[PDB]
Amino acid sequence: IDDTFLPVPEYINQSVPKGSMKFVYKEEHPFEKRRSEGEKIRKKYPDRVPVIVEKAPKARIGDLDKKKYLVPSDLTVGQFYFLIRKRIHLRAEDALFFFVNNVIPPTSATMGQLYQEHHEEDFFLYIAYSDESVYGL
Template identity: 85%
Template sequence: MKFQYKEDHPFEYRKKEGEKIRKKYPDRVPVIVEKAPKARVPDLDKRKYLVPSDLTVGQFYFLIRKRIHLRPEDALFFFVNNTIPPSCCPFCLTGTEMLSDGQLLPSWGFPLLQLLVRKAGEGDF
């Protein structure tokens, strides 16, 4: 999956910005959320989030669902490096273990999440 943010901002810029944010907020994880190209979901009002490191991916799912006013019958998926992170995983681990850019170190940059939303059909669950 392509990330527009990665294409718009070179690695050095992302690295510097991530270091600056991590220094100022050591107990938070900076996260970029982008909508997948074919996702039929309203745009988010912002794509950068400063997430508490103890917040789980499942709790973040809930927050994003509320922000985009997603109906209960619609499925929401997050992808980090083409992998769906476990919903019980805290963001402090997501940021260090599943970075979407292999060049980034754990204390730098942003985990990049991509949203994919699809309508649940009969027999999907």
């Protein structure tokens, strides 16, 4: 963009609050250890994306046993909703919301698309989940 204008998307890859979200996994694993494992795992399973899934702050919902997932890039957000919903025995009337950088990702996006836009410097994609549709509420 030197003869044309480069636009900025709306509410897509923004992270206005909290910046990069706070995660217990980051506090418990130092950065260089995470980055080293992220690089190696992207080379070993290039068709899969490493995802960290943790409960959002103030969320009222069952905790997740395993937080480290290796997800096929072609998998959509909706299928990931389906998978996480089963692992915590969510009832039919229980809601489930994902947040990536304090933003709800489109249900029709693939995990590879989210990875490319939101992966952090350790080569991991971080997803928080909640029973509420607003992060931290």
